[PDB]
């Protein structure tokens, strides 16, 4: 059973934040990493623009920066799983990431016999920049020295067990030492809170002076008996030059010169630490799972576990000795996983549990107010996902053969909990539709803040002019060129004058009356026309180019007319197409400049500056599609060079070659034009007059609409991130234009292939500046589960809030509650209160009086949409929302369950239309851990059993039960069968027989496996069981009674595996664009992937291609995708990467041809397979 993996949505959970000189030593910028993605952001003066982004075949475990001896740029140190370490650096010649070095430290002798590593590779860099260190396996401290040929000295490994250095909590390089001094916070005799009465004060710190020349590392100073709950250590910069140790309930300042200074932060420090700790009066918090960065030498900001942002100031003498600590509850923000200071007054909080935030802090012994400047969207972690139909869809698209689908995800956590409504495709909100026969091309022109005045349509024999106002009315009387076709229509003179180019010449008019008309006869009719205010260029079918200029009158009266200016751009190579570009940015240099990009018959491409017509750029082989366009000294059908982003910041070059689309991002490099172009990867398929239609301010968004068989939207906002959103709910679009009207405020109009012109707008409430169009519904509470009720089109969302824990249940004697009595400084435990809300997709609001509050200490362990047997439906079944809850009173009390069946019923009302009705609500003997449906029956795991009930009226009648494993946390059923997932004992396949009323264990997998979630792989005439585990893997098992690999059909057999690199908790299946089902899933890092079952022969072909791609292509950080996709952290493979297969589309035509030659196949065969896999997965 073979399949291909595809990444439909990249992860959005960030983990590391850094501030360094990535591009050059002049400007510093932000570098943020999340799992397999790395981003370089610049700051606008308030927005972060994505300056660069790179993907890895590996998960970044640690990130750091260093300034090497050459000092061209900063080098980046990236840790990867087990013991891989990569030094990388920006390549100015290719706008890419160049691998300086890659080091493997994966040897079993370094693991001391252990096979399971619970330690991540932790990298630290000495502040002076003389060496780096990486703690691996918690046992081996790798030291990479730096020169003060190769820029790196040979590394050497220090065995920390040479003292009794064990269980290292943290390590950090220190400031102010002449040798790299590394402080290590650890604990020789490990302890845990329950055993704190026997072992406490177990932590210790040891500072190591590293001499890299002699490889000598003595201990300069050490401290023992530090509080057991020490969490991390922060190096204090000059001139204070100490170490600040965080501990769950305490704060320490340590240094060689002064005895330690310890401060208790709450009451819980009493009886747990014998360390002398003075009490901080106005503070009552904890520092566990907190982040902190120095904003200056004297103050550092701390983001706590709950999002509280405090500012800590160090009080010093004249000789800089920390006398006291000063905290100040500055503000409250997101749950930060990372944090870094940028320019003075700016602080970045990176988060994977919420949207990352840029903050600006301003002062007013001195307090600081924090203000949110920018945010980076994040749909992770994706705890649970449901698929439903959107509430609003334009009538013209209803009754479509394909279903209109929409994803609703439980995203985030805690105060940053939310629902993410994802749609991949753009839906046009059609205001109205005109059916106009004969029109094949269109233009929209502003009449004389900017509202379009005229819509000019062209037809083989004529043209049509439409006045645009309160009504759109045909204009026959105007002085336009109504007779004959129109090849172009645009605006000149900053939207004061309008221009209409016809095959016989050019016409300059103002409003409805024409001011000027120049006949243009060059031996061939005019076939193309470009306009870059105030320059106009036209070209004929033979290849004659002409330029006109809009010149103001000498008396300043602003009367304008076109002036001929013949270009001296003669060449022996015939021009195919061209385009004009008005640069308001500063990239195009040799401040508004004018350029002409031109393609010729010999295959070359040229750029000329205007009006002197001077050559400044030349590419010898343009239609090949090289990955980097380099200056020197297949049918290129269309070309367009446009500026997008904030204030025309980023330039892009779109090229339409035969059945191929090319996107090029322009970047500065080095008489000649100091610009280069880098290819942008995409999956837009051109295979089946101007296909590229630029637009500005279509909904506050600037970009380009790409017409063709699969239309797309290309968007770049103030953030320099390219967005490619499909629009395929309507067929192939051949004509597009922007349109700002009083009835179509900031909108567009497009022609379909059935002759329908659609005046539409973009749907509001959706952010299109994201990988997928997304609507974020903040819940301010953890979203645990989401279910879609088909009959009512409403979502049931199970959420929770945190309250202070006040009582302790003591006996499962009789039920008794001890009231927790403490003092004011005590920090109460967090007690979860669960609720079930109804939310309507119409307004994405909660339905009033439709909220179910569950009992105290009652946790909702599962919530699914179930189809139970009912006699009121034609199908014999109807949908309910089923929930299983467990009342957890601690370990000493028996955990009793409860089943809760609800229905969403229609009631005479907007949001009042629907209401919750509790059809069933009964406490169960044993904890209710999972539930699903099977042939109209409700299957639920209770304790160590699984019961199958039938619902009749309002009562649940027990029909079957079976003994199961330790704890079943997930259950899903294909008709007649059931699949249950244990916490530790993998999956189990059961059968229910209606004749016997019995459950029979069909088979299972005896091997232990920490299953996260499970679902099905539905290939044609095949059934597989898809499992995710704790090691970020996917495995397809199968029940093959005749395979003999099973002892007697009782052993489930693994037939596919794949290291996705993320934890998957929610799957869902969709039909194929057969009998195949694409099994999509959402990851806990904010990403969406899919598994697509595939034929064996196509799998073999693409596997040969995959080996070719892994062996013949360079990969970031020097990693290798074959080893990245391997099992654990045995294997049968049978799952293609897809992310790796996409790079073949990124190769040039020559590279693709040579690669297919080495494989033994046709480039067209490879492209057919890849584009078909892309076509089948088009959903949402």
């Amino acid at each position: 059973m073979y399949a291909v993996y595809k990444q439909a949505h990249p992860p959005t959970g960030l983990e590391f934040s850094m501030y360094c000189n990535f591009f050059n030593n002049s400007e510093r910028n932000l570098v943020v990493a999340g799992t397999s993605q790395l981003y370089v952001y610049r700051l606008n003066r308030e927005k972060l623009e994505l300056a660069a982004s790179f993907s890895f075949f590996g998960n970044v475990m640690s990130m750091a920066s260093v300034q090497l001896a050459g000092a061209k740029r900063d080098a980046l140190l990236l840790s990867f799983k087990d013991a891989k370490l990569s030094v990388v650096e920006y390549d100015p010649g290719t706008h890419d990431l160049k691998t300086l070095s890659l080091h493997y430290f994966e040897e079993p002798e370094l693991r001391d016999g252990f096979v399971q590593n619970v330690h991540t590779p932790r990298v630290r860099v000495d502040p002076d920049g003389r060496c780096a260190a990486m703690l691996v396996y918690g046992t081996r401290l790798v030291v990479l020295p730096f020169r003060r040929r190769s820029s790196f000295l040979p590394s050497y490994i220090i065995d920390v067990r040479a003292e009794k250095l064990l269980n290292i909590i943290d390590l950090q390089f220190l400031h102010g030492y002449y040798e790299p001094t590394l402080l290590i916070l650890f604990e020789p005799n490990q302890t845990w809170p329950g055993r704190v009465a026997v072992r406490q004060d177990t932590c210790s710190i040891v500072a190591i002076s590293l001499n890299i020349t002699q490889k000598v590392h003595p201990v300069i100073w050490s401290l023992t008996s530090l509080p057991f709950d020490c969490t991390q250590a922060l190096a204090v910069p000059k001139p204070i030059g100490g170490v600040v140790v965080f501990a769950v309930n305490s704060l320490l300042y340590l240094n060689q010169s002064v005895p330690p200074y310890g401060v208790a932060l709450n009451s819980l420090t009493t009886g747990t630490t014998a360390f002398p700790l003075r009490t901080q009066e106005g503070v009552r918090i904890t520092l566990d799972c907190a982040q902190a960065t120095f904003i200056s030498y004297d103050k550092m900001v701390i983001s706590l576990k709950g999002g509280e942002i405090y500012v800590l100031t160090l009080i010093t003498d004249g000789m800089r000795s920390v006398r006291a600590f000063h905290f100040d509850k500055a503000a409250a923000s997101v749950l930060t996983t990372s944090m870094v200071t940028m320019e003075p007054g700016y602080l970045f909080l990176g988060s994977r549990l919420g949207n990352s935030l840029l903050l600006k802090y301003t002062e007013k012994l001195a307090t600081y107010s924090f203000e949110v400047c920018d945010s980076i969207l994040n749909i992770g972690p994706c705890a649970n996902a449901a698929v439903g139909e959107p509430a609003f869809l334009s009538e013209e698209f209803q009754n479509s053969p394909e279903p209109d689908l929409e994803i609703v995800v439980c995203s985030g956590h805690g105060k940053n909990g939310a629902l993410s409504v994802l749609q991949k495709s753009i839906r046009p909100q059609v205001v109205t539709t005109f059916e106009l026969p004969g029109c094949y091309d269109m233009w929209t022109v502003i009449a004389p803040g900017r509202r379009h005045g005229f819509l000019i349509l062209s037809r083989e024999d004529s043209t049509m002019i439409l006045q645009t106002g309160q009504e759109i009315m045909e204009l026959d009387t105007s002085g336009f060129a109504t007779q004959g076709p129109t090849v172009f229509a645009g605006n000149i003179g900053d939207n004061r004058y309008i221009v209409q180019v016809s095959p016989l010449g050019i016409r300059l008019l103002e409003g409805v009356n024409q001011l000027h008309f120049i006949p243009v006869d060059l031996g061939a009719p005019i076939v193309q026309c470009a306009v870059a205010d105030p320059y106009v260029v036209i070209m004929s079918a033979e290849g004659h180019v002409t330029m006109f200029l809009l010149k103001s009158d000498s008396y300043g009266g602003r009367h304008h007319r076109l002036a001929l200016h013949k270009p001296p751009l003669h060449h022996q190579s015939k021009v195919i197409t061209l385009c004009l570009y008005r640069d308001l940015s500063g990239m195009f240099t040799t401040e508004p400049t004018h350029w002409c990009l031109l393609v010729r018959e010999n295959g070359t491409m040229e750029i000329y500056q205007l009006p002197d017509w001077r050559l400044v750029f030349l590419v010898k082989n343009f239609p090949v599609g090289q990955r980097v366009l380099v200056d020197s000294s297949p049918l290129v059908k269309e070309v367009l060079l446009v500026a997008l982003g904030s204030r025309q910041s980023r330039p892009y070059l779109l090229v339409h070659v035969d059945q191929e689309l090319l996107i090029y991002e322009a970047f500065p490099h080095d008489g000649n034009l100091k610009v280069r172009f880098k290819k942008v990867p995409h999956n837009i398929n051109f295979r089946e007059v101007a296909r590229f239609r630029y637009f500005e301010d279509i909904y506050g968004y600037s970009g380009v609409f790409i017409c063709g068989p699969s239309p797309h939207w290309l968007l770049v906002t103030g953030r320099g991130a390219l967005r490619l959103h499909p629009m395929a709910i309507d067929g192939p679009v051949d004509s597009f234009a922007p349109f700002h009207n009083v009835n179509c405020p900031r909108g567009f109009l497009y022609f379909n292939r059935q002759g329908e012109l659609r005046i539409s707008v973009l749907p509001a409430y959706l952010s299109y500046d994201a990988p997928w169009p997304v609507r974020k519904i903040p819940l301010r509470c953890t979203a645990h589960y989401v279910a879609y009720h088909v009959e009512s089109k409403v979502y049931a969302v199970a959420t929770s809030t945190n309250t202070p824990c006040a009582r302790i249940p003591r006996m499962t004697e009789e039920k008794e509650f001890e009231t927790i009595e403490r003092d004011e400084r005590y920090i109460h435990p967090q007690q979860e209160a669960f609720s079930i809300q109804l939310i309507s997709p119409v307004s994405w609001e909660a339905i009033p009086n439709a909220r179910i509050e569950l009992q105290e200490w009652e946790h909702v362990t599962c919530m699914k949409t179930v189809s139970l047997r009912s006699e009121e439906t034609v199908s014999g079944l109807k949908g309910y929302v089923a929930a299983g809850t467990c009342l957890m009173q601690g370990e000493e009390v028996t955990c009793r369950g409860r089943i809760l069946i609800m229905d969403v019923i229609e009631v005479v009302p907007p949001l009042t239309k629907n209401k919750f009705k509790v059809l069933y609500e009964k406490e169960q003997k044993g904890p209710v851990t999972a539930l699903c449906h099977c042939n109209g029956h409700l299957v639920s795991a209770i304790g160590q059993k699984i019961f199958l009930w039938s619902l009749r009226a309002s009562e649940l009648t027990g029909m079957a039960f079976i003994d199961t494993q330790l704890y079943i946390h997930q259950m899903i059923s294909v008709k007649n069968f059931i699949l249950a997932a244990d916490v530790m004992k993998s999956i189990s396949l059961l059968r229910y027989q209606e004749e016997s009323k019995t459950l029979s264990l069909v088979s299972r997998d005896a091997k232990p496996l920490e299953v996260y979630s499970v679902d099905f792989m539905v290939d044609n005439a095949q059934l597989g069981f898809l499992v995710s585990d704790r090691d970020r893997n996917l495995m397809v098992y199968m029940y093959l009674p005749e395979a003999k690999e099973s002892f007697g059909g009782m052993r489930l057999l693994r037939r596919a595996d794949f290291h996705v690199g993320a934890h998957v908790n929610t799957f869902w299946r969709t039909p194929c664009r057969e009998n195949k089902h694409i099994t999509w899933f959402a990851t806990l890092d904010g990403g969406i992937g899919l598994l697509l079952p595939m034929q064996e022969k196509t799998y073999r072909r693409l596997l040969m291609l995959q080996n070719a791609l892994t062996t013949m292509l360079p990969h970031h950080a020097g990693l290798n995708p074959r080893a990245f996709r391997m099992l654990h952290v045995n294997a049968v493979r049978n799952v293609l990467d897809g992310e790796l297969l996409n790079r073949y589309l990124y190769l040039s035509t020559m590279e693709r041809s040579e690669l297919a030659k080495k494989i033994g196949t046709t480039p067209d065969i490879i492209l057919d397979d890849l584009l078909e896999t892309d076509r089948v997965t088009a959903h949402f």
Binding site: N189, T191, V196, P829, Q889, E892, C895, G943, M984
Partner: protein, 357 residues
Amino acid sequence: RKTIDYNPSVIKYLENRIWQRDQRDMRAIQPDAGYYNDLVPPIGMLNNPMNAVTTKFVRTSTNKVKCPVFVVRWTPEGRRLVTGASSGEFTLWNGLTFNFETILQAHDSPVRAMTWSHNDMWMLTADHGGYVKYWQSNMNNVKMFQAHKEAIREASFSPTDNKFATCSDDGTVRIWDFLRCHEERILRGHGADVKCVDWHPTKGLVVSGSKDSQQPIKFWDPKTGQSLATLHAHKNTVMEVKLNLNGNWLLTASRDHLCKLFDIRNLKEELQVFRGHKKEATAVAWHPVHEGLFASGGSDGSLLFWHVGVEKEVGGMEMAHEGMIWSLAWHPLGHILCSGSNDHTSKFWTRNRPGDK
């Protein structure tokens, strides 16, 4: 009358997994009694095996007719704990409330060995000078088979569960096919009274430990029957021998008051010596979750807890029992450790509650 329920901890850990990458994201469990719902099973804190040091006595379980308990074993799912006593009796206790459930006269002789196959289908048992008995999941015997004419001390299953090895008091280790009731091969390279035997989790080799002072530990090839090597780990009799699930480590417990750890690849030097007891060391149990943690029991009623990386003992109870501890069994989750001793009782031990004095 006490009880411990693991479902709240499992539920809290399941709620943690969605928004916590690993243990560096888990919040701090305060050493306070109010933080009872923040507990998680061992798999919820792999960086702190200390949590699984179970020195908090919960419940003592004693049969109506008191007999020295020779073996204790949890059922694979952890539902019921079985105690095999000198009366030849299996006593089935509830795994959540530790109350008496059932009792069966399974053997006419003191049942010494009790093991569950890697697949949860079969339970194999053996008695003093007695026979090997197969047991379904429902505790119904399907096959009784004469294995040795003398006392069988222990048995262990092959990774595929198709075959199993038994060490007996005749100084031999016999290897049998499970589907049949046939004696495949004999291993006779010992002196007398082989008291412990263990099958490797992946590789095909079997370890045995006996009363012999010249050849205490011996390795064996199961299919071939050849003696791979001889390990002179102790001078007294080796009471227990267990291979870690990682396949690299070998743990032994002997009457010379010592536990020992060896690397299976290089046997020239002892990898580690666990010293800390008052008398002999009679029982050992590797933790099912934490790779380096294990428990031991001795001739005195003491039990101790050790970690592979640590020289000194990690914890334990000095007067846990009043007789010698014959058997130790971790609950499959790893939060309960049961001890079966010679004082006619079997006790249950759990992790210490945060805030305990």
